[PDB]
Scaffold this active site. Structure first.
Site, PDB file in Angstrom:
ATOM      1  CG  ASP B 110      -0.195  -0.223   2.503  1.00 44.84           C
ATOM      2  OD1 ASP B 110       0.732  -1.035   2.521  1.00 44.84           O
ATOM      3  OD2 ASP B 110      -0.578   0.338   3.536  1.00 44.84           O
ATOM      4  CE  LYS B 162       3.525   3.644  25.132  1.00 49.95           C
ATOM      5  NZ  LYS B 162       4.226   4.941  24.925  1.00 49.95           N
ATOM      6  CG  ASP B 218       0.457   4.799   4.847  1.00 45.03           C
ATOM      7  OD1 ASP B 218       0.678   4.275   5.956  1.00 45.03           O
ATOM      8  OD2 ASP B 218       0.226   6.018   4.704  1.00 45.03           O
TER       9      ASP B 218
END
Ligand SMILES: Nc1nc2c(ncn2[C@@H]2O[C@H](COP(=O)(O)OP(=O)(O)OP(=O)(O)O)[C@@H](O)[C@H]2O)c(=O)[nH]1
Ligand SMILES: Nc1nc2c(ncn2[C@@H]2O[C@H](COP(=O)(O)OP(=O)(O)OP(=O)(O)O)[C@@H](O)[C@H]2O)c(=O)[nH]1
Lengths: 406, 360
Positions: B110, B162, B218
């Site tokens: 992607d 995160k 992406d």
């Protein structure tokens, strides 16, 4: 000899018509191309023996009203006079205050028409029913839905004699499916109860429905005539679109030259379309069902127009889609712009027709209704105006959905 | 030198396009994205690539065998009967990468960027450890996992899934160079590589990071598909400017396939890629839209930021805004408005969609 009294309102009554009533009075707003009381004056001038048409209201006489009066006097070959009240006297107080001007020349009967109704106006059938029975008050009534009747003035009648036994203007419960159409036929004797009402206010403002119709019901003075023709109430600004739809349907029998036809050098036309002769429409445009075009309107190429009213001086540029909208006077819509509204009709036969309050809102949210552009509103190119009310002399720059742009 | 490409495994984003053809087979600027990757790959000089597919993808077999013939490089087809994730593909084709002890590319499908393959090889030979990652700048650190970089070496210290701490600006770019000892570490299980395997070899500090200079996206997401199409047409404007089509009613960077037809008197706005066989009719305004192949957009329409699927029929006076993805063979009726409408394939729309919702 017959007379006709058209009760036009005043500037306070037109506030609910607000973004369109900022430039012209609500009686002079064009539904299906001609102003909304010109339908009443048309139907009253068609009645044989009609000598005079009086308009009672508390508008101040400005240039649109006097210009309309001169044009109507020239067009219909009848004296059309404007009687201006000194104060808002209600629906019956103007009839009682101008009783000497109404009864001048001793007429046999006089029609009393509310100026905000769209009707097929069966004045000849009503007149002949009155000429047989000769009662003081004759009402025009139509059948409504059981849920919708709570919005209008319900009439409980006796079916043998067609005499109303009860009148409630806005009942919370169902009492009757027959509603008052705002068309009345008055005998000269009918100015005698109104006087009594006036004297009871002294021991000025007379409401004809609450003080006269509800109080004298069942005593043999008020009678009903029932029709099946078209009827609508023009209260808000978007109700005029539904009245335009009804009047353009009526034009198939009444004025067949006013509807526009398919022309090889002209635009495509679906349904009933009124185009003014001064308006220049491009041939690539298609004008869908129930579309009214005013004078001096430039319509560009590729313009889709469906269920709309385009007021005079407005310009729609190329590839502009306008659906369920009222485009104001001199207001310009740029190219590839989409002016869209959601259909909202005030018909008493539809069960989920809307309940037609003063509030345009619900729970903070604006209700999806007719998109109204005021006068001289500039819509930029490639911008969507969806379900919105735009106040006049506004220049927009981006897309607005479900708003009131002040 | 070889290269593994991670493809198949049903891209859940941009799902109205993924439901018809696989996610590496949808067209990105009149070309599939797997074509972009393997064309830049073969410009690098890799003699055979392996692509690892778990969804049964027979038209991918078909196009990929035809492009084995077209390109001149061999293509090997590792077939997976369960979803093995994104590390399991390395362990299923692991003896083909253990054939030769030389570092191999691992590429995500992607990603679109300017592909610096030989500079990556130069960097991997300079730093001399097991794994090299590619990293990029993203303005929005609260969306993707960050990677800490020390200057002049490019070594990782830690790898953080995160956000919301701001320890780094740099984001993983989906390009890895891996040694066979890394594949020696990868096991057969369907574990993903970047959740576990990259974390442990970032903990040993084997992992190093190479920076792009610009133009990365992406495009697994439809709004990211449109943003990457904008950036690809920017890069195409200042790399081969004669390939974008110029005209009087053409604004900005517009890529038109020679099979596409554009009608008279219509304004094709900026960042538009029209596929092969597209029929744009008379008076259509298209800005920031990607119209895939065989789709017909009828007259007087308006289109901003939209993905029009294969063999679509957008009607007349249709307004489409807010990344409304149409699937394959979607018939939009005349005088409608679509805003956010992710429409599933083989649908007929007769009502306007005023807020973003999925039509099925
Ligand atoms: N002259 C005059 N006309 C008025 C006055 N108030 C209202 N009207 C007109 O009388 C008609 C009806 O007035 P409303 O009070 O709104 O009554 P309605 O709600 O239409 O109800 P119905 O007549 O039963 O259908 C409208 O055409 C108004 O313009 C007034 O104070 N003076
Ligand atoms: N061949 C194989 N390929 C896989 C599998 N799972 C993921 N992939 C590929 O892994 C690559 C990168 O993973 P992602 O970025 O999450 O893409 P995705 O699997 O398409 O998921 P979404 O894009 O969020 O819908 C993609 O090119 C997928 O085709 C699998 O189980 N078998």
């Amino acid at each position: 000899m017959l007379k006709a009294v058209i009760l036009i309102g005043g500037p306070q009554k037109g506030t609910r018509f607000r973004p369109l009533s900022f430039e012209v009075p609500k009686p002079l707003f064009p539904v299906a191309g001609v102003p909304m009381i010109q339908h009443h004056i048309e139907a009253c001038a068609q009645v044989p023996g009609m000598q005079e048409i009086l308009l009672i209201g508390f508008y101040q006489p400005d240039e649109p009203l006097t210009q309309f009066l001169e044009a109507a006097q020239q067009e219909f070959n009848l004296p059309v006079r404007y009687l201006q009240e000194f104060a808002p006297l209600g629906t019956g107080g103007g009839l009682y205050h101008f009783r000497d001007q109404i009864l001048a020349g001793s007429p046999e009967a006089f029609f009393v028409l509310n100026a905000d109704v769209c009707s097929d106006f069966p004045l000849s059938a009503m007149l002949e029913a009155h000429r047989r029975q000769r009662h003081p008050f004759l009402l025009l009534g139509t059948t409504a839905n059981r849920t919708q009747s709570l919005n209008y003035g319900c009439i409980v009648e006796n079916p043998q004699t067609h005499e109303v036994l009860h009148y409630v203007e806005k009942p919370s419960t169902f009492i009757s499916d027959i509603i008052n159409c705002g068309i009345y036929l008055f005998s000269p004797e009918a100015l005698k109860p109104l006087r009594d009402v006036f004297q009871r206010n002294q021991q000025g403002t007379i409401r004809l429905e609450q003080d006269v119709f509800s109080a004298l019901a069942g005593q043999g003075q008020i009678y009903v005539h029932l029709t099946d023709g078209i009827w609508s109430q023009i209260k808000s600004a978007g109700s005029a679109l539904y009245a335009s739809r009804l009047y353009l349907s009526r034009y198939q029998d009444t004025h067949p030259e006013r509807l526009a036809k398919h022309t090889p050098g002209g635009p495509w036309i679906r349904g009933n379309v009124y185009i003014h002769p001064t308006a220049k429409v491009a041939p690539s445009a298609v004008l869908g069902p129930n579309v009214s075009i005013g004078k001096g309107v430039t319509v560009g190429e590729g313009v889709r127009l469906r269920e709309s009213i385009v007021l005079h001086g407005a310009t729609l540029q190329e590839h502009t889609c306008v659906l369920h909208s009222i485009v104001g006077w001199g207001s310009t819509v740029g190219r590839w712009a989409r002016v869209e509204g959601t259909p909202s009709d005030p018909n008493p036969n539809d069960p989920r027709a809307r309940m037609d309050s003063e509030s345009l809102f619900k729970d903070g949210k604006l209700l999806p209704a007719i998109t109204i552009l005021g006068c001289r509103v500039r819509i930029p190119a490639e911008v969507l105006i969806l379900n919105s009310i735009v106040l006049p002399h506004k220049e927009l720059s981006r897309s607005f959905t479900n708003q009131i742009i002040l | 030198m070889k290269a593994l490409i991670l493809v198949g495994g049903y891209g859940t984003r941009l799902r109205p396009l993924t439901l018809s053809t696989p996610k590496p087979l949808v067209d990105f600027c009149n070309k599939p994205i797997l074509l972009h990757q393997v064309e830049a790959l073969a410009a690098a000089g890799v003699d055979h690539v392996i692509l690892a597919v778990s969804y049964m993808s027979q038209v991918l077999e078909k196009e990929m065998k035809a492009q084995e013939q077209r390109l001149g490089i061999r293509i090997s087809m590792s077939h997976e009967e369960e979803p093995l994730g994104t590390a399991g593909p390395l362990a299923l084709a692991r003896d083909l990468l253990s054939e030769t002890a030389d570092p191999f590319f691992v590429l995500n499908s992607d990603v679109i960027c300017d592909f610096p393959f030989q500079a990556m090889v130069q960097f991997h030979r300079h730093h001399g450890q097991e794994g090299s990652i590619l990293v990029t700048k993203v303005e929005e650190p609260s969306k993707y996992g960050v990677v800490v970089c020390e200057a002049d070496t490019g070594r990782i210290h830690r790898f953080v899934e995160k956000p919301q701490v701001f320890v780094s600006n740099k984001i993983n770019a989906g390009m890895y160079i891996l040694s066979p000892a890394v594949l020696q570490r990868i096991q057969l299980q369907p574990t993903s590589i970047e959740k576990e395997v990259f974390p442990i070899m970032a903990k040993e500090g084997q992992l190093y990071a190479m920076e792009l200079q610009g133009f990365w996206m992406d495009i697994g997401q439809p709004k990211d598909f449109l943003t990457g199409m904008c950036l690809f047409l920017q890069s195409l404007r200042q790399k081969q400017p004669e390939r974008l089509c110029s005209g009087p009613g053409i604004v900005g960077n517009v890529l038109v396939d020679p099979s596409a037809r554009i009608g008279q008197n219509c304004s094709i706005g900026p960042n538009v890629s029209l596929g092969p066989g597209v029929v744009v009719e008379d008076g259509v305004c298209i800005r920031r839209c990607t119209v895939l192949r065989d789709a017909r957009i009828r007259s007087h329409s308006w289109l901003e930021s939209c993905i029009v699927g294969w063999r679509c029929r957008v009607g007349q006076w249709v307004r489409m805004e807010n990344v409304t993805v149409l699937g394959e063979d979607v018939i939009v009726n005349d005088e409608l408005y679509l805003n956010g409408a992710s429409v599933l394939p083989h649908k007929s729309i007769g009502e306007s969609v005023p807020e973003p919702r999925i039509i099925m």
